[PDB]
Amino acid sequence: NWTPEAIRGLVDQEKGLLDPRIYADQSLYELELERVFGRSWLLLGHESHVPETGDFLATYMGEDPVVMVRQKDKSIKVFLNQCRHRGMRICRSDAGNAKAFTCSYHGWAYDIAGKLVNVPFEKEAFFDKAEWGPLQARVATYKGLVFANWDVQAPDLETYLGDARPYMDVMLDRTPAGTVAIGGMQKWVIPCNWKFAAEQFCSDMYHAGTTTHLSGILAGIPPEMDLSQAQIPTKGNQFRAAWGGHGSGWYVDEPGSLLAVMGPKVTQYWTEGPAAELAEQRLGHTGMPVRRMVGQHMTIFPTCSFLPAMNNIRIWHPRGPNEIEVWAFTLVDADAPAEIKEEYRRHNIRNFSAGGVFEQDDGENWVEIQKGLRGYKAKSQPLNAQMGLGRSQTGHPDFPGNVGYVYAEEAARGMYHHWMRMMSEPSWATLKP
């Protein structure tokens, strides 16, 4: 049994150590489903996935199937995809438009709000229908992005995100028209723990700066160039959130990282001219020189990761300690030229899908990692998260918050420390910021 005391010693943000059991242990996993996924704000998608009355997306929150649906009044509701009669899936397609939801088992009927509104033979066989609809999550939107949380006593989304909002805004707050999701959402399965993924996007530019993406970079540079000519970016910064375990890292004034991935047309869009100027002007309140932020990774804890310049967005659905599903999609400015939208669509497919020249190599790592952790000794010694220890500060004249060097495990040490908190403190009264 995992005591608060036992859980606190899985991480040590002082010495920079992690117990490898955190990624393999079944007991700890069941706890996460209650203590982490049960009460966290989890990303479900985007307002554009469900623009019209009755439009719906069937997605997950941990291992709980949920339906995200647009109401007549324009609000979004999120309710468990489970009939409380005998557990049947109420909504049985991936996405679409509904006037109602009917259970296929015994035909209990629901409206688009998840209210139980008809029970066949109710008169003859029966109880208050208004007390027997699917559990409802709280629904909260950040500039397009739809989040949801089961927990009534959890912090509101804005309070949850807190000072991470400027970094999300780099991607989400660049035009008066907002972003929109490009159609389609990719789904695939990697046999690894979710934390490898959520961390990597939280804190890890290191892998892209070293050996992991040597071949993906090669795929994006011109045919006349080989890897020895490649510009190795070393300039940039890393943000650890004040509360929540959120994290973002980015390159500064080194476009070669962004050029190879997203190509000249997008790299220009992001950094020079009307759009990029407008964006820096809109992000003025932050004082951030966003035209100089050329390649960024971010994670809103637990499982909302994205790559602000390439605008690849992803949810990690946990599937035990040993597996995840990755659900990916991509964002564009609603008023970006059709040229730039198309550049975003192509290059996201090229780099970040299941077949992508970057993605192939990220998941190759995580699979072998998870495989080693089946070993006894493989779990007996702690892992090294000591990169950039006590090097971050909130003074930074360019980027707000706890900021350090781009190769650092501070954002990681924060995420894991926040993971540990949620897993050892049962009451939101001690846990809230």
């Binding site: 789904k187 071949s215 299941a354």
Partner: protein, 183 residues
């Protein structure tokens, strides 16, 4: 409960010589891939290739038009001659970790259905496949689907070039960690 298909007459059957030629082409193409002869394989692809594998979704019958991703949507692949080239550079690279060590694939090709187009020496071909991928110690990925090709007679080794390929894969969620293979 009839369909508009009823008013169409079936295509001219491909002759035996041509049926065989196109079967043989795919068999030799599968050999290229299964032997990891990637540069040789990339040489089959026409400069104007569009190589496209759309997403496939679970839809109610009355929403079947929505089953596959669209023209402007994300896809698993949506490639051109130039973007395929970068993929070849990655898969043949010493530091391409996903395929170094290389995976072990088999492309079993069958159900080859050939149609002559309005353009002589250009053919629309529909074929089925099972692609068996075995990786590292114990990983096994099995894919099934159909390929819709536009093939042109060409003076390469195999006698044809691939002008278009669309891969309709029998999956929604991909059960594999990646698509590090070619279809």
């Amino acid at each position: 409960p009839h369909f508009f298909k009823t008013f169409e007459w079936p295509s001219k059957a491909a002759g035996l010589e041509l049926q065989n030629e196109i079967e043989q082409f795919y068999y030799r193409e599968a050999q290229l891939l299964d032997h990891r002869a990637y540069e040789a394989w990339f040489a089959l692809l026409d400069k104007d290739i569009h190589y496209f594998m759309p997403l496939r979704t679970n839809r109610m019958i009355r929403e079947g038009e929505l089953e596959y991703s669209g023209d402007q949507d994300l896809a698993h692949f949506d490639e051109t001659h130039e973007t395929m080239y970068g993929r070849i550079r990655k898969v043949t690279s010493d530091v391409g970790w996903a395929e170094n060590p290389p995976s072990r694939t088999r492309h079993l090709v069958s159900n080859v259905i050939v149609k002559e187009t309005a353009t002589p020496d250009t053919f629309e071909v529909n074929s089925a496949f099972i692609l068996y991928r075995n990786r590292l110690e114990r990983q096994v990925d099995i894919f099934a689907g159909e390929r819709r090709d536009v093939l042109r007679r060409a003076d390469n080794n195999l006698g044809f070039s691939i002008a278009k390929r669309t891969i309709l894969l029998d999956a929604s969620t991909l059960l594999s960690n990646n698509l590090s293979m070619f279809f």
